[PDB]
């Protein structure tokens, strides 16, 4: 499968985080969460705030300690803002395997994701389960079947994988 290696320094993310029972339940409600965020003007507001560290809006899947799964819609933002209403988190530095989904959101993303999970099955010692993974949505028309969504999966010690020697 095609992917690019990218690295990120520590980042501050601003947005809204919701929590669901598990991965399956999250998929049922994520589309709704996005719909609610757009309708209430949250997306527009968050878009004003990105300092440009990452281009776009992020949809992060965050594992919770009790087995629950959280989803956060956010942008990379500056710490120096009052920022009372929004949820804020620090995304720890990491290296990632970055994949692309070409197509209309979100079906193109879901199908690409099933594929990604299957592919990373072979990199069990390198993937980081407790670490957040995310979809990055750049400016553009989601509807177009030429639209590209980036999927960022965090990894550790990937250089040591035998397939790379």
Ligand X SMILES: CC[n+]1c(-c2ccccc2)c2cc(N)ccc2c2ccc(N)cc21
Q: Is the Cβ of residue 35 or residue 79 nearer to ligand X in the bound state? A: 35
| Closest residue by Cα to residue 134 from 13, 39, 47 | 13
Nearest to residue 109, comparing CAs of 70, 83, 138? 138
Residues 43-82 contacting ligand X, CB under 6 A: 59
Rule CB under 6 A: is residue 137 a binding residue for ligand X?
yes
Distance CA 134, CA 131 (A): 10
Identified binder of ligand X from the candidate list 13, 16, 34, 71, rule CB under 6 A: 34
1 vs 31, beta carbon nearer ligand X: 31
Tell me if 20 contacts ligand X by CB under 6 A: no
Interface with ligand X (CB under 6 A), residue from 142, 144, 160, 161: 142
Give the total of residues touching ligand X (CB under 6 A). 10
Break-preceding residues in the chain (C–N over 2.5 Å): none
Cis peptide before 106 (omega within 30 of 0): yes
Binding site for ligand X (CB under 6 A): 30-31, 34-35, 38, 59, 105-106, 137, 142
């Amino acid at each position: 499968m095609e992917y690019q290696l990218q690295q990120l320094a520590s980042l501050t993310l601003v947005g809204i985080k919701e929590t669901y029972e598990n991965g399956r339940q999250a998929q049922q409600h994520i589309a709704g969460f996005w719909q609610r965020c757009y309708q209430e003007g949250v997306i527009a507001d968050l878009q004003l705030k990105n300092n440009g560290d990452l281009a776009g809006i992020l949809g992060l899947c965050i594992p919770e300690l009790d087995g629950k799964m959280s989803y956060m819609i956010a942008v990379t933002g500056d710490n120096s803002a009052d920022i009372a209403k929004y949820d804020v988190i620090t995304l720890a530095s990491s290296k990632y395997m970055v994949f692309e989904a070409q197509g209309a959101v979100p079906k193109a993303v879901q199908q690409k994701m099933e594929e990604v999970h299957h592919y990373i099955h072979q990199y069990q010692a390198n993937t980081v389960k407790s670490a957040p993974f995310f979809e990055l949505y750049q400016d553009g028309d989601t509807t177009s079947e030429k639209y590209i969504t980036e999927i960022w999966m965090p990894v550790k010690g990937l250089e040591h994988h035998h397939h790379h020697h």
